Ligand binder design. Sequence first.
Ligand code: WOP
Ligand code: WOP
Lengths: 149, 149
Amino acid sequence: SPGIWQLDCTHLEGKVILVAVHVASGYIEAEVIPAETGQETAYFLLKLAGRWPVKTVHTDNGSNFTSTTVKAACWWAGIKQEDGIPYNPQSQGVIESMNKELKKIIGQVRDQAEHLKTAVQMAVFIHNHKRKGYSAGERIVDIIATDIQ
Amino acid sequence: SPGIWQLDCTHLEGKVILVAVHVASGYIEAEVIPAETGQETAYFLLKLAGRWPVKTVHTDNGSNFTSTTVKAACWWAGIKQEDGIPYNPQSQGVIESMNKELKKIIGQVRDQAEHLKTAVQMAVFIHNHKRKGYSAGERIVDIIATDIQ
Ligand SMILES: CN(Cc1ccc2c(c1C(=O)O)OCO2)C(=O)N[C@H](C(=O)NCc1ccccc1)c1ccccc1
Ligand SMILES: CN(Cc1ccc2c(c1C(=O)O)OCO2)C(=O)N[C@H](C(=O)NCc1ccccc1)c1ccccc1
């Protein structure tokens, strides 16, 4: 549970937003890319796994699952690639709801940020710090700390 | 001390590597940029603070300390800007030693990474996972978890 992440790809302004969600906490990292290629996904996974203990990734689609570059990044970083099929069906709705929340925050910061990539990072910040009362950022730290001990 | 970070800018292959170090743990995040401008530094700080609880940043030089865009990012993200003067002089030798270790790791991965940005992320991964004994990644999580608790 502490090492399980889910990839999520959403679209806004004709651009692609790639998100990784730590399943157990709701914590996220995200980037804006021109298009979702194996190479972009592979590089994003390498970044993520150098930053948090990533054991398993539920990839967002079959193209990335199949991609030799994504497989190469997962081999390099010690990540088990798994499908992202929602065997528990409430998975898709949790993801769809987060995409909607993220796009709303992005819309709320549209004065403040000239570039979409800035607005996406502001939305990452607001999502991870939001008190739900613990934040997603507090939950991921406590889950992993409990794991290390 | 759990919220204290230090910025570090080092150079390789005519390119700029920007590093943030979590002072209490040695944990890092890093990126390759074309040039160290206020805007690049500002954006890097925004990303960092949405990912970890950043209370204070010891900026790497006076130009970023001064920059209106860096000040705007720090205001936005709730970060106190401080100078990065080694009042404690052992601070600056620790930074030089890290820069050397990073460039060494980067050299060791060049039969594996086509682009410098990839090699840099591989070096972040190896640095944060390296067992010193706990890893830097383990130390940051434990430091912050104790802070929450
Ligand atoms: C903290 N910050 C955001 C930021 C930080 C670093 C970056 C950015 C951005 C960004 O805004 O996308 O773009 C790449 O490097 C900032 O100071 N914004 C400046 C500004 O004038 N905003 C008002 C505004 C709102 C809407 C339109 C125009 C301006 C700004 C600073 C430099 C470049 C562009 C904008
Ligand atoms: C996991 N990985 C690294 C990686 C992942 C994602 C990326 C990358 C890189 C990168 O290497 O910089 O660049 C943009 O998106 C990978 O499979 N590399 C491919 C390869 O052939 N490397 C051997 C090699 C070593 C030395 C020279 C040439 C090749 C590769 C894949 C796509 C593009 C370029 C290289």
